[PDB]
Amino acid sequence: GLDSHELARLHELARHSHAVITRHQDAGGAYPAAPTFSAYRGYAWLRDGSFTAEGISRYGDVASAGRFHDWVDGVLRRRRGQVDDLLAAVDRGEVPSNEGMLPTRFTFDGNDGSDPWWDFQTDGYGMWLWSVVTHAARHGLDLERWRAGIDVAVDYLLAFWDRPCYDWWEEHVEHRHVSTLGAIHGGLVAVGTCAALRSAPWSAATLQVAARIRSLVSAEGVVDGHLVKWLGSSAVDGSLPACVVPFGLVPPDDDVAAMTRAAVAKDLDVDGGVHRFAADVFYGGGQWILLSALLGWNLAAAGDTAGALRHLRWIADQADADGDLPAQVPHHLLHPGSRAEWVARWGTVATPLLWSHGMYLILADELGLLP
Ligand SMILES: OC[C@H]1O[C@@H](O)[C@H](O)[C@@H](O)[C@@H]1O
């Protein structure tokens, strides 16, 4: 579905995506989120990093992806005691506050980069489980390399999956977000269906909890045939297609999958650029590369190759003169009056965003375009 002009440009953007991710990877293995964006400099997120790692793994850079997994594993093994203490607190009937939970931002040396009172999130731990299992399966690797870190993440998620937390967008701590539940589900199903992990003590529990997640989403996370942004809402969010591919709450051909893709397209997709959610005021609520990629990936998986390609083309059109992809662009803004204050406070939008490049690589690979 691409002519020679397009193929050459998409291949170049794929090469550049690999280069900019691997050039910015820290010496210790972490992928930074946004190396030139002042507010985020020096920090890694498991969400951004896991999708970045999946793009890199698909591209075939086994060494780079493995160094990311090494970094995450080591960071998590260092939290074995913190997690054990949280679990012991629960067993005494003393549920830990958000302030005591595992962090969202990490420094490259594995310390808390932010205070979880202000940004407590569980999705990234689920994403990491999905990512490391998927990588190991793809490349025929022994998961024992990363198993003790996997164990920490699994124990944590089995205890805390059903807690309210901030969403992927670091908002609304009181709610339970369907793409957060979806990320956890994806990670738990990945480990619970992995033959190499068949004897883990938590093996059965992971699939039972994944079923509990699906029960909760069925009860409170579906309205008018589509997934919704958080349990008990009516709105959609551009992250919701992740609950189809890759996280697997429903197959790509399920009616809920189709309806969710359609609702996201109708409510949030403007000319191929997907907004996060209707109420979004961050930088005025622009169009996010990673969300267009996510929708494209989902369209490809459902057999809508043309729709996938349209989103791939839109993403490529957002690359700057160096090939770098921003987090978002302002061609359409949901709340334009809100934009200038974000720019005054934090500067211009993060570019490159490694996750943008990682998602580009995933979609390109889905469409058979990795050179
Ligand atoms: O890139 C780091 C973080 O930036 C935030 O603005 C986004 O809402 C998160 O989804 C992302 O993980």
Swiss-Prot record:
Optimum temperature is under 35 degrees Celsius. InterPro entries: 6-hairpin_glycosidase_sf, 6hp_glycosidase-like_sf, GH15-like. It is found in: Cytoplasm. It catalyses: isomaltose + H2O = beta-D-glucose + D-glucose. The keyword Transferase does not apply. It comes from the Bacteria. Optimum pH is 6.7. Stable between pH 6.5 and 11.2. One of its GO terms (biological process) is polysaccharide catabolic process. Coiled coil: none annotated. One of its GO terms (molecular function) is hydrolase activity, hydrolyzing O-glycosyl compounds. Its main location: cytoplasm. One of its GO terms (cellular component) is cytoplasm. Substrate binds at residue 117. Keywords: Carbohydrate metabolism, Cytoplasm, Glycosidase, Hydrolase, Polysaccharide degradation. Signal peptide: none annotated. Involved in the intracellular degradation of the cyclic tetrasaccharide cyclobis-(1-6)-alpha-nigerosyl (CNN) formed extracellularly from starch. Catalyzes the hydrolysis of alpha-1,6-glucosidic linkage from the non-reducing end of isomaltose to yield beta-D-glucose and D-glucose. Can also act on panose and isomaltotriose at a lower rate. It displays low or no activity toward CNN and the general GH15 enzyme substrates such as maltose, soluble starch or dextran. Belongs to the glycosyl hydrolase 15 family. This is Isomaltose glucohydrolase.
